[PDB]
Design a protein around this nucleic acid. Structure first.
Lengths: 100, 1177, 33
RNA sequence: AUGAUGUCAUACUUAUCCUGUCCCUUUU
RNA sequence: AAGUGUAGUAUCUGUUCUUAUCAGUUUAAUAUCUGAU
């Protein structure tokens, strides 16, 4: 991501699941990282949601509230048809913040 | 140049085909998939006529079409594989007549990528799963499951990525509720990718990989792998379970192999060949297509070969294994692209070129003298086939669908003003020069001369239960006659009219009661022998009348009208009022009693003072005016009809006015039907009521997919009209012409254009119009074939070879091979050759169908271009220059030499003579005039030659061409040269110095296939990749001259045509309209691009497109911006095809569009119809 | 501010409608010929 | 008369970011 | 006379190669580096 270049997207095969984003990251684009002009809905991976992994935030990684969508800039650029955009990695962010 | 796309004729070619009960009823439907449009057909079981039940533009590249039927259902889904990575499962909606998207799931990126699934799509037999596979490195398996509400839920897909595995095809295995399996003909490419010696490239055999989708493991796995002897071409799943055994029959070059699963062995059967066939021995045979007739008793397959000979495969099955493969010559069919064996004994065979076919399955393949070649029958040697005509099939109908339109010329080649579109399409024996004309062909059932001066015609039935016509009244100038319609048309007098004078009207008043009106008065003749007459009080003459289902209005002189009501007991009650109009009535209109109402609400009356008025016919406002309407001309007639109704009125001029039906008059529309009076009558066709015209042309307007549309009838003018119906005549027009009768009928309800072709021998290349003779010279050239003299030489050689066998020598069978020449069009053209080709010059009468002149080239020759023009040094001798090439080849290793035969074309433009024969250098592909000289393209050289004594003296040469001269457009001073790999280039030819110099070039390249001169600096060109562009030179172009080149031009127009266009000569279509660019397509479509003459109109169209992009998107999941910008981006092109969905859009979508546009939905409809009326026919 | 263009837009629409009516009348007169 | 070097300061960009938890380690 | 942290970038200050050659790595080529006179 623009805020977290050291992140690793899942890039898994798409499923039939609809994801949700954390309330703190409400409205943020999953790929474009923008805040306006959404086009398409976000599809979660099959393994990306199974029990405890169900209901988590796509980008924020926390408990989701609202249903997310792909940014229109990402949809027109043929970017929304990619793999599962689940943030599997968690590093270089919120690591030492718990220490503070 | 803001152009607007307009599709006049949709694509008729069939690319994919499926057959099944998709309508959810007992009827069997046929789903056809063209290049960019889907269609659903429900042909007549009894009538045997194929009607286009539904046609919807997919807005995408339909690459695969496979059906689906869930377990325990009675309605089949439709899997639509597109160029996009979205797998779509749609379902029919006959209640709304719209294709409903049941499920849509994204799989990958866009574009027909190698790693993009869409090249192969399969559905299992159990209906439990579907599979999508790309050309390589992709395989997804989607699971279908029934919901509690019977909602087909698409589960997540299974990943089956197999690297370095190229999939040749896919098919479903047979499983009776067990672990299903899917078969694919895979080929490994990774091993040969690391073989510099080239050895591992060979010994790389394709293998049948059967992957099992374990329902328990929920993951695909390589279940079985089985190599084959040679590479295959197609697969067919033998149905298993309770019906037949499991297995997959694979066709390969001169072989068909049944190798089922388990311990079953491989059974082989070679492909037969034609006995003493003139084809090449090195050319093998492959299964072009195959269908299966699954029955509860047994199952057979019908497979078409490369030569079109449809063979009948029967799977001889043992107790638990395959016994043998029984093949038999079923029939001889054309080059088959798809085959569907539907119920009720029907076989829909769609060819890759030419009209479709729909035969009746009469013989089951057995009980005949034809032999059955079986896999157990040894041979060493192939079983020679004895072809014959259609013995087991009968051709019921033929779906025209004019496909490959190689060339096109839209001009008044005939003596008429309505220009004809001479369009050549076909493939060798399937040649057809269709002179398309915008109209409707009325099948003349019968015609009979009427004496005197016939004035009017009407047709009244016998009773309410009568399913056919009973009486036909013909009002002469001084009398009226009646005829009884009972398959015995003769005189009739016992009807009860007593009309010794001309009658003003005659119809069926009640369920069986007749109501006649003559100038003497009215006469009600009930079902019994009774005729209640009612005289006209006073000297006022009956001016007009109008009947209804339960009401009858009469109009005398001075605007004195009278009403009559049909009582429930059959009594005719006279109106209790004397309604006086503003003036005398030129005509009146009255609607029919609907099912719910007992009479009409409003009734129309037009005065002689050019004004119409509708008055309430109800009792609350009886004889009360309701709404006025302006008439700028003398009203000629009036008519109202349903389909949501409308009111039409023909004026005294050659034009008419239509408006919406309501308590008041709404919008207004007009079109010149005209140079004749606008007469109108009622008719009923296609299960819909409509208005039949009577003017200079019979414009027959009817609803066409929720949209009014009208074309004229291709016949003489009609003076009076009425409907006729019987057992022989389902629904037709009984019409009175000038002293003649005509019982015509037009079933073709597909509003488009009618045509009749003049076929040829070889496939066409181009056309040249003879100006003085008004003839047409077509260059018939087809490669991979032999000449007629070549065929004779080969036949003589084969005859000598057969006679050299000395087989009791005494076998007098060679005469049958020498004399009995099978039909090249019916039994196929036995042609071959890797480099052998053939050409033929032909000049034929366009109005006629005869070839006035024919000329044959050599056997090793091949034509590429032709033209006709006069020489500057010569007089009025319009010479025909035709270029051809010898020893050519599709592979990149052919040139040999080029020849430009100099045809004389004399004797009143009807006598060709190739005097001069100047030889070319490379491969000639162009010839045109320029300053009286002949500008020709010799490869990468432009030669301006002058017609000499021996050969065209090359008076000037230019060597600036990049790859090869693909097109040459001769401007007044410049010349547009379009290369094969490079874009257009404008070159100026200084005549004083005699030097050609490239004036500029293009920025983006395009494989130009055709071209057109738009203006003095604008040039339009197609693209081999399916694009159409328009380059306009700037004002600063240095016409005087002395990254690649100096001067460059800009791209002023860009739009994806969707289908490969190959002809563009936009000029003037419907006379009185604005000129436009008519563009053809290789898939049988003729569209028209026209400009937006208003910035406000451009903004309105842009807003409409921006709204429709999100309101009513396509079903294939492709985006309009992507569907239009596939090869190159869009540049000022408004896709009117997507705009046409506003008429078919839902009501909520219509309201949303009207709100976003700040106008009415009928406002948008009128705005859309205005462009079609102004710029098209 | 947009109301001014809206009034001007309606005026231009009426002018274009009158021009289209004249063009249709001319085309009808030509078709009569 | 451009540069390489790297302790030590300085401006900037990523619409960067403050309630984040042991809901999961319960191995002897 | 107040800002917290997570990654990266540039402009500032101080120092160094008149080593003649050969071979190699590396470089687009230099350069740098590695061994001998």
């Amino acid at each position: 991501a623009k805020h977290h270049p050291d992140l690793i997207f899942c890039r898994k095969q798409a499923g039939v699941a609809i994801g949700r984003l954390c309330e703190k990251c409400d409205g943020k684009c999953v790929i474009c990282d923008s805040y306006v002009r959404p086009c398409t809905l976000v599809r979660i991976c099959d393994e990306c949601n199974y029990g405890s992994y169900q209901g988590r935030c796509v980008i924020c990684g926390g408990p989701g509230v609202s249903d997310a969508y792909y940014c229109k800039e990402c949809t027109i650029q043929e970017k929304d048809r990619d793999g599962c955009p689940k943030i599997v990695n968690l590093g270089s962010s919120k690591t030492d913040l718990f220490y503070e | 140049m803001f152009l607007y796309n307009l599709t006049l004729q949709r694509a008729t070619g069939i690319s994919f085909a499926i057959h099944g009960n998709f309508s959810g009823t007992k009827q069997q439907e046929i789903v056809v998939s063209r290049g960019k449009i889907l269609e659903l057909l429900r042909p007549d079981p009894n009538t045997g006529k194929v009607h286009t039940l539904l046609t919807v533009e997919v807005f995408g590249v339909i690459r695969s079409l496979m059906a689906f039927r869930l377990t325990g259902g009675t309605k089949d889904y439709i899997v639509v594989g597109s160029d996009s990575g979205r797998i779509v499962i749609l379902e029919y909606q006959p209640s709304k007549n719209m294709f409903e998207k049941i499920h849509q799931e994204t799989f990958g990126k866009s574009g027909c990528r190698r790693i993009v699934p869409g090249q192969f799509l399969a559905v299992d037999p159990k209906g439990r799963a579907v599979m999508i596979s790309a050309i390589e490195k992709q395989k997804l398996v989607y699971i279908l499951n029934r919901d509690a509400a019977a909602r087909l839920t698409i589960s997540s897909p299974l990943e089956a990525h197999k690297a370095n595995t190229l999939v040749y095809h896919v098919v479903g295995v047979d499983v009776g509720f067990e672990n299903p399996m899917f078969a694919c003909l895979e080929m490994d490419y990774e091993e040969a990718d690391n073989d510099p010696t080239g050895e591992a490239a060979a010994n790389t055999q394709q293998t049948l990989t059967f992957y099992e989708l374990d329902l328990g493991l929920n993951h695909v796995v390589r279940k079985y792998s089985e190599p084959l002897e040679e590479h295959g071409n197609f697969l067919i799943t033998v149905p298993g379970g309770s019906d037949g055994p499991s297995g997959v029959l694979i066709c390969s070059e001169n072989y068909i192999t049944y190798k089922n699963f388990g311990d079953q062995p491989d059974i082989r059967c070679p492909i037969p060949r034609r006995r003493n066939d003139l084809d090449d021995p090195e050319r093998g045979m492959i299964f072009v297509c195959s269908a299966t007739h699954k029955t509860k008793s047994m199952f057979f397959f019908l497979a078409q070969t490369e030569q079109g000979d449809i063979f009948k495969i029967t799977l001889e099955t043992d107790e638990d294994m395959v016994t043998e493969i029984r093949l038999k010559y079923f029939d001889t069919v054309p080059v088959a692209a798809a085959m569907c064996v539907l119920k009720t004994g029907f076989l829909f065979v769609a060819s890759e070129f030419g009209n479709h076919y729909l035969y009746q399955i009469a013989h089951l393949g057995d009980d005949d003298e034809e032999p059955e070649f079986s896999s157990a029958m040894p041979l060493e040697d192939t079983f020679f086939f004895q072809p014959r005509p259609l013995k087991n099939l009968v051709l019921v109908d033929e779906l025209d669908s004019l496909s490959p339109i190689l060339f096109c010329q839209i001009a008044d080649l005939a003596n008429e003003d309505t220009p004809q579109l001479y369009v050549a399409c076909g493939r060798g024996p399937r040649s057809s020069l269709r002179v398309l004309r915008h109209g409707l062909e009325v099948s003349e059932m019968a015609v009979s001369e009427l004496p005197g001066n016939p004035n009017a015609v009407w047709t009244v039935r016998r009773h309410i239960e009568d399913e056919f016509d009973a009486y036909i009244i013909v009002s002469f100038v001084n009398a009226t006659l009646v005829l009884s319609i009972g398959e015995t048309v003769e005189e009739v007098t016992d009807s009860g009219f007593l009309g010794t004078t001309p009658t003003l009207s005659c119809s069926l008043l009640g369920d069986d009661a007749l109501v006649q009106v003559y100038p003497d008065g009215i006469r009600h003749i009930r079902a019994d022998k009774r005729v209640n007459e009612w005289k006209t009080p006073g000297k006022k003459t009956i001016v007009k009348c109008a009947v209804n289902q339960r009401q009858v209005v009469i109009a005398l002189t001075g605007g004195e009208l009278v009403y009559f009501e049909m009582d429930p007991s059959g009594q005719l009650n006279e109106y209790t009022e004397r309604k006086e109009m503003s003036a005398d009535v030129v005509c009146m209109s009255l609607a029919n009693v609907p099912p719910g109402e007992q009479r009409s609400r409003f009734l129309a009356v037009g005065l002689v003072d050019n004004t119409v008025r509708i008055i309430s016919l109800d009792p609350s406002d009886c004889l009360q005016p309701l709404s006025m309407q302006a008439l700028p001309a003398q009203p000629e007639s009036l008519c109202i009809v349903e389909m949501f109704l409308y009111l039409n009125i023909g004026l005294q001029n050659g034009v008419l006015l239509r408006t919406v039906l309501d308590p008041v008059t709404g919008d207004l529309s007009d079109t010149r039907t005209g140079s004749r009076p606008v007469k109108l009558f009622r008719v009923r066709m296609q299960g819909q009521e409509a208005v039949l015209a009577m003017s200079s042309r019979s414009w027959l307007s009817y609803s066409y997919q929720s949209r009014f549309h009208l074309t004229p009838l291709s016949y003489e003018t009609l003076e009076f009209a009425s409907g006729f119906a019987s057992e022989q005549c389902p629904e037709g027009i009984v019409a009175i012409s000038t002293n003649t009768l005509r019982i015509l009928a037009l079933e073709k309800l597909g509003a488009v254009f009618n045509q009749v072709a003049f076929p040829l021998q070889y496939t066409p290349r181009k056309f040249v119009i003879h100006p003085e003779s008004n003839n047409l010279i077509i260059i018939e050239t087809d490669h991979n074939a032999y000449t007629e003299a070549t065929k004779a030489q080969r036949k003589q050689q084969m005859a000598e070879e057969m006679v050299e066998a000395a087989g009791e020598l005494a076998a007098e069978m060679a005469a049958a091979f020498l004399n009995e020449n099978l039909p090249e069009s019916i039994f196929g053209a036995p042609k071959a050759g890797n480099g052998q080709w053939a050409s033929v010059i032909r000049v034929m009468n366009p109005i006629q169908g005869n070839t006035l002149d024919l000329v044959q080239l050599e056997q090793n020759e091949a034509a590429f271009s032709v033209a006709v023009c006069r020489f500057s040094n010569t007089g009025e001798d319009w010479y025909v220059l035709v270029g051809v090439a010898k020893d050519l080849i599709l592979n990149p290793r052919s040139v040999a030499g080029g020849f430009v035969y100099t045809y004389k074309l004399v004797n009143n433009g009807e006598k060709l003579e190739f005097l001069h024969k100047t030889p070319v250098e490379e491969v000639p592909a162009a010839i045109a005039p320029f300053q009286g000289r002949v500008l020709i393209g010799v490869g990468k050289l432009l030669r301006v030659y002058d017609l000499g004594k021996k050969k065209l003296l090359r008076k000037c040469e230019n060597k600036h061409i990049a790859n090869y001269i693909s097109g040459i457009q001769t401007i007044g001073h410049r010349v547009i040269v379009s290369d094969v790999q490079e874009s257009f280039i404008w070159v100026r030819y200084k005549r004083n110095e005699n030097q050609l110099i490239i004036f500029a070039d293009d920025t983006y390249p395009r494989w130009v296939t055709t071209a057109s001169l738009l203006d003095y600096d604008t040039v339009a060109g197609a693209d081999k990749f399916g694009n159409i562009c328009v380059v306009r030179l700037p004002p600063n172009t240095n016409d005087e001259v002395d990254n690649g080149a100096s001067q460059k031009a800009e791209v002023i127009m860009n739009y994806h045509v969707g289908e490969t266009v190959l002809s563009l000569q936009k000029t003037t279509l419907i006379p009185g309209g604005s000129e436009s660019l008519v563009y053809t397509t290789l898939s049988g479509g003729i569209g028209i691009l026209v400009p937006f003459t208003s910035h406000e109109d451009h903004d309105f169209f842009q807003h409409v497109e921006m709204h429709l992009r999100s309101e009513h998107p396509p079903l294939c999941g492709r985006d309009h911006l992507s569907f239009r910008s596939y090869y190159f981006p869009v540049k000022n092109v408004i896709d009117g095809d997507l705009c046409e969905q506003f008429n078919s859009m839902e009501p909520n979508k219509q309201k949303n569009v009207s709100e976003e546009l700040d106008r009415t939905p009928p406002e948008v409809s009128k705005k859309l119809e205005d462009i079609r009326t102004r710029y098209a026919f | 501010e947009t109301i001014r263009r809206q009034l001007e837009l309606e005026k231009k629409k009426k002018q274009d409608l009158d021009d289209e009516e004249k063009t249709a009348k001319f085309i009808e007169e030509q078709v009569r010929r």
